[PDB]
Design a protein around this ligand. Structure first.
Ligand code: HEC
Ligand code: HEC
Ligand code: HEC
Ligand code: HEC
Length: 107
């Protein structure tokens, strides 16, 4: 597959941009986030046209916000869904991984 980015990359929303760092996720399988689409591999941007291209709505499969922040039952793992579990085991990282403000995602 392509080489994983070695510097934080930009995850553009409609107003905010959150930097995503691959290094701390080196042990997570690529497919967990870059999930298969139509049975095929894809490393395209999450908010690509035809993917999670609704950058303003809070819900719906097309909502980038939803695929990122939902803790609900999803077809794939969201950032918050996994972070909740990590935080359950490492409570000292609650603010860093799940905070809406002053977190590692939203400083
Ligand atoms: C606490 C539970 C949080 C609240 C409430 C919000 N976030 Fe986040 N967030 C993250 C990413 C990767 C993005 C960019 C992609 C996108 O969702 O569009 C954002 C963006 C926002 C936004 C603005 C949405 C927009 O610009 O269209 C809002 C209002 C927002 N977030 C609220 C990632 C993360 C993250 C990293 C794991 C955490 C802990 C949070 N966000 C927490 C919250
Ligand atoms: C979730 C925790 C992830 C894991 C595990 C991996 N990647 Fe990733 N990657 C993820 C995001 C949120 C982003 C930003 C996409 C965006 O919306 O901008 C990326 C980006 C990439 C890219 C660059 C594509 C691009 O954004 O233009 C590549 C080439 C990439 N990721 C590769 C990759 C590989 C090979 C992985 C496993 C070793 C891998 N990623 C894991 C989220 C996640
Ligand atoms: C288009 C080629 C896509 C890219 C690139 C990414 N996603 Fe996706 N995602 C896409 C579809 C067609 C679907 C529906 C389910 C399916 O697998 O066919 C999804 C689903 C998700 C989900 C679950 C959403 C739900 O409502 O259950 C999540 C959590 C999700 N996608 C996350 C995600 C992330 C973080 C991506 C970037 C690394 C990403 N997707 C890329 C289509 C596409
Ligand atoms: C589990 C399968 C994960 C998914 C999906 C996402 N993240 Fe993650 N993240 C995970 C771990 C194991 C860690 C490290 C915790 C530790 O023990 O130290 C992280 C860390 C981050 C961080 C913090 C890095 C730092 O600055 O210290 C960020 C900012 C982060 N993760 C972002 C992020 C985003 C935006 C995701 C969705 C695209 C995402 N993570 C998914 C585990 C998992």
């Amino acid at each position: 597959a392509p080489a994983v980015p070695d510097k934080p990359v930009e995850v553009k929303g409609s107003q905010k941009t959150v930097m995503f760092p691959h290094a701390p996720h080196e042990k997570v399988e690529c497919v967990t986030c870059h999930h298969l689409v139509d049975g095929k591999e894809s490393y395209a941007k999450c908010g690509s046209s035809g993917c999670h291209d609704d950058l303003t709505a809070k819900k719906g499969e097309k909502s980038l916000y939803y695929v990122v922040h939902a803790r609900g039952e999803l077809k794939h793992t969201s950032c918050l869904a996994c972070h909740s579990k990590v935080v359950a085991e490492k409570p000292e990282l609650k603010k860093d991984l799940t905070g809406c403000a002053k977190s590692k995602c939203h400083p």
